[PDB]
Design a protein around this ligand. Structure first.
Ligand SMILES: [Zn+2]
Length: 257
């Protein structure tokens, strides 16, 4: 099956998922000088006050913090979006070392990690229907750099020991994702894809300019997770990022001057 190794990593995914070589693949390098300021772009509206987290899952490629998406409780709108997108899950991508781990890059800079808050367009009714549409998802991407601790991340860090291996889940209620946001909601946006199989071209990407800081100890705990299942040979869950893909016929727009 697909993964992040020599024999099953990103350079192999096109064999099972030919859209890997498509016209709107993610992630991309954000060339800050070429991104055009678009005064028509609206402020992002992040409404997470009623978010209901339920569970955290090690799915063998990352860990997902899952939300109740059976009502408009945690929604993204505005920015480049038409209509309302409901939060379903967030997860991260990270490196074996602090000098790599992000999926998007900024003028070729790689951050230590990248947070993806995944939302689906309510006009398609369910996540599974939304991923079949070119405007089905909105993913809010936030870079992580290593420095000061992020206090709002620590509850996530401390549950990871309970989901070390693939297929383990734990109850994870009352987690407030507002504690993972930077101060500024300035962003870049472009049309792209899921960054893991099935690589569907269904995402409006919204990548925040301002990173969050996490401590070395916080990211070190991400790197103790395992790709393998319990009682299998230990393979540390590190370098679970897809590198930048060709921009092709796309424009990256900036919300800010
Ligand atoms: Zn992701």
């Amino acid at each position: 099956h697909w993964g992040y190794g020599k024999h099953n990593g990103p350079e192999h995914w096109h064999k099972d998922f030919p859209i890997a070589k498509g016209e709107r693949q993610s992630p991309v390098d954000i060339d800050t000088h070429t991104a055009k300021y678009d005064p028509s772009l609206k402020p992002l509206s992040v409404s997470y006050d009623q978010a209901t987290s339920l569970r955290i899952l090690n799915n063998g490629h990352a860990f997902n913090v899952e939300f109740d998406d059976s009502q408009d409780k945690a929604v993204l709108k505005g920015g480049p979006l038409d209509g309302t997108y409901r939060l379903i899950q967030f997860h991260f991508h990270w490196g074996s070392l602090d000098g790599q781990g992000s999926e998007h890059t900024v003028d070729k800079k790689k951050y230590a990690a990248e947070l993806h808050l995944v939302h689906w367009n309510t006009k398609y009714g369910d996540f599974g229907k939304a991923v079949q549409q070119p405007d089905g998802l909105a993913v809010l991407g936030i870079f992580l750099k290593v420095g000061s601790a992020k206090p709002g991340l620590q509850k996530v860090v401390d549950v990871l020991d309970s989901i070390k291996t693939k297929g383990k889940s734990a109850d994870f209620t009352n987690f407030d994702p507002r504690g993972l946001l930077p101060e500024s909601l300035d962003y870049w946006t472009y049309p792209g894809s899921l960054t893991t199989p099935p690589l569907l071209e269904c995402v409006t990407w919204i990548v925040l300019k301002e990173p969050i800081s996490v401590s070395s100890e916080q990211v070190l705990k991400f790197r103790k997770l395992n790709f393998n299942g319990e009682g299998e040979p230990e393979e540390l869950m590190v370098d679970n990022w897809r590198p930048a893909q060709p921009l092709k016929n796309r424009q990256i727009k900036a919300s800010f001057k």
